Amino acid sequence: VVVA
Amino acid sequence: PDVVLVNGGEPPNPLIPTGTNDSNGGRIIDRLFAGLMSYDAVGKPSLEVAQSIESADNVNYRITVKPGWKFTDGSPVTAHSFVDAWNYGALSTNAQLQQHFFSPIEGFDDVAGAPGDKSRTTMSGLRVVNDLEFTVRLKAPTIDFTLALGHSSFYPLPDSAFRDMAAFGRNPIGNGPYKLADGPAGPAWEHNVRIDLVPNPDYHGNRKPRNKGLRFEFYANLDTAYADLLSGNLDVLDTIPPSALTVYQRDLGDHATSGPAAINQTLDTPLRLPHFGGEEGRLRRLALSAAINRPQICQQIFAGTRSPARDFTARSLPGFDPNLPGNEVLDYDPQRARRLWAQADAISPWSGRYAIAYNADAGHRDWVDAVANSIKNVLGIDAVAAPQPTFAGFRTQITNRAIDSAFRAGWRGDYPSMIEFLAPLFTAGAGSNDVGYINPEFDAALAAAEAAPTLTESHELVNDAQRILFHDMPVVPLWDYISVVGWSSQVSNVTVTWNGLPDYENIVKA
């Protein structure tokens, strides 16, 4: 997932 | 408060598994559903909803579903709950960000090239045999397909979802260890504030909660989160902010743990921006990479809690090699950076501003300021930081292409595979390819790695493929993570997983  | 209080953020997108490509939505989705496999804290899969997953060849799969599983609306989990959800994710008409996870399946090309006059809405390779059995035929051997079956893209959905998917995304119904709370004072999901979950009493799988519920608090600022942790108003903080990295050990003692996590960070410059496409853009991306001092930033900004990138994946993954030939593009070299930037200027002289956008709610300010200043000083250009308040709004601008500058990005692994760090970001059609990078030669090399019969040969082919990424620098890899997680005196049994997240189901609260 694209990370914060 | 019986419930475990943990940090999170507002999901950029509705809570549909195939529509979720980010960690804010992902950490909620993974509490609400159970897939064919479940992952333990080190990322190893075990049969969960599946009774069996059989493939002798990594091409043909026979999947049987355990009987008696149901969603929290009472309806059963069947082979159709999986097949319908996977076809929904794969069909281009549905514009699901996780579409690329279905790409190995025969028939994907019929549904994925575009909506199309194709007339086909489902994948021929995905076939229901009976209520609790279906088969999957892949286009080619795919070494990671079994491992991937714990990932959210493959979660099952209840029948009602398909009659109104927008409604579902606002109020999801799953089959997993938790469910959205039936809050006593308002909705479970208070947008931009928090999400409240309670245990799902139907659930009897591998991740049974050891606590009475979870509250994901959507902090606007990680300093506030750290203060709440120290005061006991937050139970688990999975990201200690930069301002506390030299102090968390004295503040927290044995209530903080650190370790490598399969998470990376990149500087993304869309190929559609002025001066950043074609060969000109390639040279400029290589220059940016040479203009950033990763060891120095890792030491000073992050107090040693990031490790300089040596490839496009992450140090802790199987097969990772920090000494790949051509990785010198990731070394600081100001003279080289200036040479490359000038060679780009030979094509078209640079003009304007280089801005690095970032979500300020997750502690990126210090490093982005440092990177922008390094670029400014090495290359003599107007390089600046451009903060936006929330991850949700930032990702929305990246996804719809409104964003008009460079921006930070980074991948938290979904399962421990280098391929999984590359296919979603750098293949031509992937939903998480934020920059518009396309190189059919890279996609072909990665497909060759996926087709290898052993993990060893596959890793070798992955790194061969990364040579192309060293040449093209599709994004600039910065560093991978040493996660630091702290918890309050009211909780225990806190384990940090291989990808840096708390093992939420196993947290205990007295």
Author numbering:
A (entry chain F): 1001 to 1004
B (entry chain A): 32 to 541
Pull text from the paper.
By contrast, the DppAR179A protein was produced in E. coli in similar quantities as wt DppA and was purified to apparent homogeneity with a yield of ~2 mg/l. The atomic structure of DppAR179A is identical to wt DppA with an RMSD ~0.11 Å. Collectively, these experiments showed that arginine 179 is essential for heme binding and identified the heme binding pocket of DppAMtb. To examine the role of heme binding of DppA, we expressed the dpp operon containing wt dppA and dppAR179A in the Mtb Δdpp mutant. While the dpp operon fully restored growth, the dppAR179A gene did not restore growth of the Δdpp mutant with hemin and human hemoglobin as the sole iron sources in HdB minimal medium. We further showed that arginine 179 is essential for heme-binding by DppA in vitro and for Dpp-dependent heme utilization by Mtb.
The components of the Mtb Dpp transporter include DppA (R3666c; substrate-binding protein), DppB/C (R3665c/Rv3664c, integral membrane permease proteins), and DppD (Rv3663c, ATPase). The substrate-binding protein DppA associated with the Dpp transporter binds heme with high affinity.
